Amino acid sequence: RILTTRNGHTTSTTQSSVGVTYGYATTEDFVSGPNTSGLETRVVQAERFFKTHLFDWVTSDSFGRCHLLELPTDHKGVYGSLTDSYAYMRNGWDVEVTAVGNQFNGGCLLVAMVPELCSINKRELYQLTLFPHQFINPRTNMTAHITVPFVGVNRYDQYKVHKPWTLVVMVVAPLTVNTEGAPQIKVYANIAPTNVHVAGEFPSKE
Amino acid sequence: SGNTGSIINNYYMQQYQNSMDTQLGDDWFSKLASSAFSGLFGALLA
Amino acid sequence: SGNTGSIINNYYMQQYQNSMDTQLGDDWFSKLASSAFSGLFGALLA
Amino acid sequence: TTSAGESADPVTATVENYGGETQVQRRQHTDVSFILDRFVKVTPKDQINVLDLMQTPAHTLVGALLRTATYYFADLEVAVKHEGNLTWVPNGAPETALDNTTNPTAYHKAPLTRLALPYTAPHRVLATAYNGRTLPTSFNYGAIKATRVTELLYRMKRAETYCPRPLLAIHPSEARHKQKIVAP
Amino acid sequence: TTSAGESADPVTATVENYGGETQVQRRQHTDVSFILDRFVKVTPKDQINVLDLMQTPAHTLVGALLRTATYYFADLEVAVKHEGNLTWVPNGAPETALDNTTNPTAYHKAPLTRLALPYTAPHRVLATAYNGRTLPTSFNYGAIKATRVTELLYRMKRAETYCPRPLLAIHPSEARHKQKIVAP
Amino acid sequence: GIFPVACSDGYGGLVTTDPKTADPAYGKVFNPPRNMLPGRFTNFLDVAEACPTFLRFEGDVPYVTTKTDSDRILAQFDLSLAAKHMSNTFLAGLAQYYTQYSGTINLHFMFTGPTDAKARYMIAYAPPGMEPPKTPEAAAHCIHAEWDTGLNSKFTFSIPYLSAADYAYTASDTAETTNVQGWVCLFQITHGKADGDALVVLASAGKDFELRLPVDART
Amino acid sequence: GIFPVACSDGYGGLVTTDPKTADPAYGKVFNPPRNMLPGRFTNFLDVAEACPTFLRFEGDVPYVTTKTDSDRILAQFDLSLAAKHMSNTFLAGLAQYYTQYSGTINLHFMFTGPTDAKARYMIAYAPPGMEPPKTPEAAAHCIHAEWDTGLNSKFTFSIPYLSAADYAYTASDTAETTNVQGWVCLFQITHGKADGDALVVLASAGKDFELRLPVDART
C-alpha cells in the first residue's frame, strides 16, 4: 500500500497507507468573490510541505489525552512571509500525520481536522469521528492522511485574528510495548497549504 | 419547505417574505452515507 | 412600485386608491451617471 | 484616469485601471420611491393639523431625503391616533370645513386610523425650498381635525424627486464619528 | 462485514448478512429545515434585545440541534409579548436607532406581535463556534426594543447547516436514564 | 354590501409549531452568495449513518479489554438509546429529541492489539422475555456472529429491530425494570496472547434506522 | 351559512414599514400635467456617482497644500464613511441612512497651482492589520498610483473594496479603536516651485458602490 504525495518540489512516500480522507469536499469553493474586487492572486510557491513535532505518545497516556495544533501555525518559509505581506488569505490543508513504532506495539490514535475549535470537553471526544479523520493503529499503519478545503463565514480570512482549522490527535486506546514493540512513539506532522490565495498588499516596515 | 403546510400561495411577494439568495460563478453527508460499503469483504459459504 | 409587496390586485379601483396623472402635448441623473468617462485619457504601457 | 477637472462632465474610474475587477451592484435600497415609502412620525398639534411634509424633522431618514429634492410629487398616507371623529379637508378649503362631517370623516376605531389621500395641490409639483425659510401656503395636502390628535405619521406614495440638494451627515469632533453599534 | 477500520470510509452492514431484510424508512422528522422550523423560547432583557440564536438554551431541541452545526444560514421569525411599540433594527445599526419609529415598528396589538425578518448579517453564513466561547459581534439578526418585552420566541426559517459537531444526551448514573413517560 | 365572514371560536391562537408564516416588514434584501460551501448536511440521519461514534464502558473508556479468566463476557447492556453505554454517541444525542424509532443499529468493533496478538469474538442479540445469556454456548442459540482478528481490524454487525409493535420508545420509563428491547452481548471466545489488548466499539445508524415524533423533554 | 375564518393572533398590528396600502376615501382626482420636468433623479446613487463632492481637511478646507519639508504626507485618514474628512460629502450624507455597503469609492484630485508650478503625487490604499505607511517608499508596496501635473488638472483613483466579509459597516463602533477598513494615504513625491499651491479633492461613488439595509439612527 504505497502512496506518494507531491506538493510543489516536495514529496512524501509511505508504504503503510490506509488511503486519504477528504473532508467536507473534494474541491474548493469559488476563490474570486466580491470581497476582493478581483485583486486576489495565487501563490504556488507556498504550496509545499513544512514539518513539526506534535508530541510523544507514551504508555502512561490514557484515553482522551490529546494534542491540538491550530492552523495556520508559525511558518518560517514563504507561506509564513505571505501572512506579513498580505492582509487577506485563504488556503486548504494537505495533512500527513506520522506515528512510527513497529507492528509489535498496540494501542490506537485518532487524528482529525476540526473547524473552529475553541476547546473541546471530555464527553465530546466520544464523537470526534464526526470530523474529517483517520486512525493510526500500529498493527496496520503508521501514517494518517487528511485533506480539507478552506472553510469560514468569510470567503477570505485574517489569520492574525482567526484560525479556521485545528489539527487534533487523540489517544483512544493506550500504547502497549509488550517486550518487542518500540518503547515510545514520537508523533510528527507533515503539512502543506493548498490553493493559497492572497489579497491586499501591506506596506513595508521602512 | 420545512414545517410549512398551506396550500395557498403566500399573500406577499417572495421578495418581501424572505431574503433573496444570490449565486457566484443533503449534499456532502448524503453522498457520504450513500457511498457506504454494505456487503462482505470476503468469500461467502452457503 | 416602491415599498409594496402584495401579489393580489388592490380591492379598490386605481381611480380611488391614487390621484390620476395627466399628460401634456432615473431620467436625467441616470443618463448623466451612465455617460461618465471610464477609461484612461492617455497611452497605456503594459 | 486623468481628465480636465474644470469641465464637470462626470468621470468614473474603475479598479480595472490597476488590474482589479468591478463587481455587480444591487441598488434597490437607494431607489427614491422605495426609500421614501415608509411612515415617519411628526409631533402634532391638539386639533387642527395642516398636512405638510416639511413638518418631518430634518434629521430623520424621510425628512433628510425629502429635503435633498427641490421639487417633488407624491400621493399620501397618514396614520392617526385620535379621540372623536377625524375629518380631512382638501387643499384650498376654508378652515371652517374641518367641522363638517360630509368632508371625508373617519369614525373612531381603536387603535388608530390609516387613510390614503390624493395629491391635492394646484401646482404640478411641490417644493422643499422656494425663493419668494418660508413656503407658499398652497404647499400642503389639506388638513385634518379631531377632538384631540395624539399621533400623526406621514407616508409618501409614488414619490418623484427633481434637482438634488445637499445632504449632510453629522460633523465629528474626532477623526471619526463613533456610535455604539448593536451587538450581543 | 470486515473492513479496514483505520480508513474512515463509512461502512454500513445490514441484516441481510444473516438472512434478515432491510425495511423502508421515512426520515422527514430528521430533515434539518423541518426540525429547526419551530418556535423556541428565550429569556429576554427588559428593553433592548439583540436577536442572537445563541441565546437559545443549549439543552432545548432547537438550541442543541443548532449547535450541532458549525456554520448555518436562516431567515427568522419572532413572536414577542411587549408593552408599547416594538421597534426592530438591522445588523450593523447604531443602538440609538432603536428609538426611531421609521425603522420597522409594530404598534401594540394584544396578545403579541409575530414578525418575519430577513437574514441581515454581512457574512455569507454565520457560525455557532469561532476560533478567534465568544462570537464576533456581527453575528446577529439585528435588535428589538420596546417599553418592556415579556416574552421572546425565535423560529428559524429555510435553515441550512454545515459541518456537524457533537450532540450529547444526558449521562446516566445508572445503567439507563429512566424518565416518567406519559401514561393513562 | 361586503363579504360576510364568521370569526370562529377555537381558532387563531399562536401555536409554537404551526404551519404558517408571519407577515413581513423589511423587504428586498439580497444575501451574500453562499453556493457550494463545503460540509453541508440536510438530514441528521445521514451523518448518524456515515459517522459512527464511540460507546462508553466501565471506567469511561471506548473499549473493552481481553481478559484471561473463566468469565468470557466482555460487555452486556440493555438495547436502549437511553443506556449508559450509548450515552456519549451521536445516535443517543439525536434520539433524545424524538419519542419513537425502528430499524437497524450498527455496532463496529476494531481490534487494537499488536500483530502477534490474536482473538476470536462473538456478538449476540438476546430478545426480551428471558434473562440474557451468561456464556457463549448459551448465546449460540440467539442471532449471533463470530469473527477473528487479522489483516482487517474492523467488523460491523447489525442489531436487528425485533418487537411486537412497529415502533419502540427511545426513552426508558421509570416503571420499566427489565429492558423492553433486549440485550446486546459481547463475548470473547478465546484469545492468543491478547491480554490487556483493547477492542474499541462504535455505533452508527443502519440503512433503515428511523426516528419520528419530535419532542423537547429537556436533557 | 357563511365563510368561516380564523382571526390570527400576532398579525394585523400597524407596522411603520409594511408592504400594504391604506383604504382610500376621496376619489377621482386628476393632477396637473407634469411630464418631462427637468432634473429628475430616481436613485440616490446615480447622483452620488455623477456629482462628486468635496472632502474636508484640517482647517475646514477642501484642499491640501504642497509643502517643502522632509515630511511628504499630504493627508492620511481612515477609509470610513464616518471619517471627519468625508463628513461633508454627499456620499457620507447618504451612507448614514444605511448600515452596510460594498464596492468602489472614487477620489478625485484637481491641481490648482499656476502654469509654472509642477508636482508629482501618490495615492495609496493601506489595508487593515498593519500601521499605515509614513513614507512614499514604504507605501510603494501597497496598491497605489502616482501622477504629475500638466494640461489635464484632474486625476481620478478608485479605492478598492477589500475585506473578509462581503459587506462592511457604514457606521464606526465606539469600541473600534483602529480603523476596520484601512487608510487612504496621499503623498507628495516632489514638486517644482509649487509651495502653497492647492490640490482640491472630491469623492464620488464608483460603478459598483452599493448601500443596503436602510436605518434611521438620528444624525
Author numbering:
A (entry chain 2): 13 to 218
B (entry chain 4), C (entry chain 4): 15 to 39, 65 to 85
D (entry chain 1), E (entry chain 1): 1 to 132, 157 to 208
F (entry chain 3), G (entry chain 3): 1 to 219
Please share excerpts from the published article on this structure.
FMDV, a small non-enveloped RNA virus (genus Aphthovirus, family Picornaviridae), exists as seven antigenically distinct serotypes and many variants and sub-types. Structures of several serotypes determined at near atomic resolution have revealed a capsid composed of 60 copies each of four structural proteins (VP1 to VP4). A prominent feature of this otherwise rather smooth capsid is an exposed flexible loop (∼30 residues) on VP1, termed the GH loop. This loop and the RGD motif embedded within it (residues 145–147 in the O serotype) comprise a major site of neutralization by the host humoral immune response and mediate FMDV binding integrin89101112.
Comparison of the PanAsia virus capsid with a high-resolution X-ray structure determined here of native PanAsia confirmed that the integrin had not significantly altered the virus structure, except for the GH loop of VP1, which contains the RGD. In most O serotype viruses, including PanAsia, a disulphide bond bridges residues 134 of VP1 and 130 of VP2, causing the loop to become disordered. Reduction of the disulfide bond stabilizes the loop against the virus surface abrogating integrin binding.
